[PDB]
């Protein structure tokens, strides 16, 4: 660590173009040190000097593992740049050469190749699927075919987990079904590993895989991970809670039967703290998740009631970031749409009406339609009980009616005909 620090690009080129493998090794190391600096590494200058095809061919030098490692690392850092820079590494032929290095006897060369394939896959769906077509999944999973993951070096195991996550990542298209099936059993195993970074990235992979059509949700749910995801939902580390919650929220976008699985695993008991979580994205995600559960069957609405989660929705509707308040309005409008009369009435006893009316002062136009539908649904339930007028006073007493008649002269046709309708019918 003296003679390879801060070389010029031109000296690097001189060394790599010599016919001396040791000179090439030193110049390759010098390139990797240039590309490893934090202030603006000269990725584009390295590419312009035509070094990528040389680095790629150094990957095949089984005879000289240090130059394998140095060029793997240099190419890793190029591939970590822009799409155009990652494309240059791929266009050099790096993908098959990195896959051959997965089997290397040198764990630090293996690991660099894992990392490099993670950067390439991370660029997007096309490179992700190209890494898969070159056959990266089998050698990667083979690196985890040990009796106890604890015997692997922590850094190595985190990197492998991260790279598998990128292979599960991104949409249009989602990853090939066969590849998901190939990776899932290993993901299930990683989801029980004790290291918080492995757990975080495993949850992230599950959250990618569950963010699609219901048959994707089913192949994940079929592996029985929902109880483990619920347990991770209660972790103290927010880097674990955040992807676990998105996975759970993705799963409840599916069928009534998939949604019931997260309820039966005990998720509803975590939502008192999730719906008051100080970190805004957790509260929003948790409320969005609640909104899809209140779009479930009536017996699932009843389990929301039994767990005492309605006052937490009232709480979120009363005070939260506006985007979370918006998810709570959806949760209420979904609840009132599919609930029984008694469930809808319980909503009023809990105090839904005033914070609901206060939100009609939002100028987001979509939420106003969502709130008006909810009120319609609540009046309809009360009129099955002749309470229509006792509810009118409540809406009147909190400034409600003033707000609805104000939107009687609103922009949107769907807004003011519902405001009109409401007053025409329930007030004046």
């Amino acid at each position: 660590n003296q003679g390879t620090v801060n070389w010029s690009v031109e000296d690097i080129v001189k060394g790599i173009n010599s016919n001396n493998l040791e000179s090439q090794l030193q110049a390759t190391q010098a390139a990797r040190k240039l590309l490893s600096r934090e202030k603006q590494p000269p990725i584009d200058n390295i590419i312009r000097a035509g070094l990528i095809p040389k680095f790629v061919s150094f990957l095949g030098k089984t005879d000289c593992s240090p130059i394998q490692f140095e060029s793997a690392w240099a190419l890793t850092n190029i591939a970590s740049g822009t799409s155009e820079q990652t494309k240059a590494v791929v266009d050099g032929g790096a993908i098959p050469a990195f896959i051959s290095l997965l089997a290397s006897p040198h764990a630090h060369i293996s690991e660099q190749a894992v990392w490099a394939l993670g950067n390439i896959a991370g660029d997007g769906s096309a490179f992700r699927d190209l890494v898969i077509k070159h056959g990266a999944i089998d050698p990667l999973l083979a690196l985890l075919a040990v009796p106890d993951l604890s015997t692997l070096a922590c850094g190595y195991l985190r990197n492998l987990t991260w790279t598998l996550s990128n292979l599960c990542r991104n949409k249009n298209p989602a990853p090939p079904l066969d590849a998901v099936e190939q990776i899932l059993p290993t993901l299930v195993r990683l989801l029980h590993h004790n290291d918080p970074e492995v757990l975080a990235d495993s949850c992230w992979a599950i959250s990618y895989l569950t963010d699609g059509p219901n048959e994707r949700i089913e192949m994940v749910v079929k592996k029985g991970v929902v109880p483990q995801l619920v347990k991770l939902l209660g972790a103290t580390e927010l880097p674990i809670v955040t992807p676990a919650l998105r996975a759970i929220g993705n799963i409840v976008t599916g069928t009534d039967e998939q949604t019931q699985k997260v309820i039966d695993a005990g998720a509803l008991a975590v939502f008192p703290s999730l719906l008051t979580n100080p970190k805004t994205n957790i509260q929003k995600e948790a409320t969005w998740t609640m909104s899809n559960i209140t779009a479930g069957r009536q017996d699932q609405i009843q389990q929301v009631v039994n767990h005492g989660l309605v006052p937490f929705l009232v709480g979120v509707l009363s005070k939260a970031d506006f985007k979370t308040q918006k998810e709570a309005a959806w949760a209420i409008t979904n609840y009132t749409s599919g609930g029984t009369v008694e469930q809808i009435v319980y909503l009023v006893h809990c105090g839904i009406i005033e914070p609901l009316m206060n939100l009609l002062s939002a100028k987001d136009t979509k939420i106003i339609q969502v709130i008006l539908d909810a009120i319609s649904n609540i009046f309809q339930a009360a009129e099955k009980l002749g309470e229509t007028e006792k509810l009118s006073i409540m809406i009147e007493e909190c400034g409600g009616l003033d707000k609805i008649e104000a939107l009687q002269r609103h922009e949107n046709e769907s807004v003011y005909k519902a405001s009109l309708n409401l007053i025409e019918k329930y007030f004046s």
């Binding site: 590309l35 490893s36 934090e38 590494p41 690392w73 890793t76 850092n77 591939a79 970590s80 740049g81 990652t86 630090h108 660099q112 990392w115 993670g118 950067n119 991370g122 660029d123 991260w162 996550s165 990128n166 990542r169 991104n170 949409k171 975080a200 990235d201 992230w204 990618y208 963010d211 955040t242 998105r246 929220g249 993705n250 409840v252 976008t253 599916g254 009534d256 994205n281 969005w288 909104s291 899809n292 779009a295 479930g296 069957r297 959806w330 979904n334 749409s337 599919g338």
Partner: peptide, 27 residues
């Protein structure tokens, strides 16, 4: 119907989300 289930709109990249690419600082 009951198809009031609303799919997520958050994309798989960007803030909050894990790094898509990372450089190696050293060994």
């Amino acid at each position: 119907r009951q198809q009031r289930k609303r799919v997520s709109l958050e994309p798989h990249q960007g803030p909050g989300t894990p790094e898509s690419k990372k450089a190696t600082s050293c060994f």
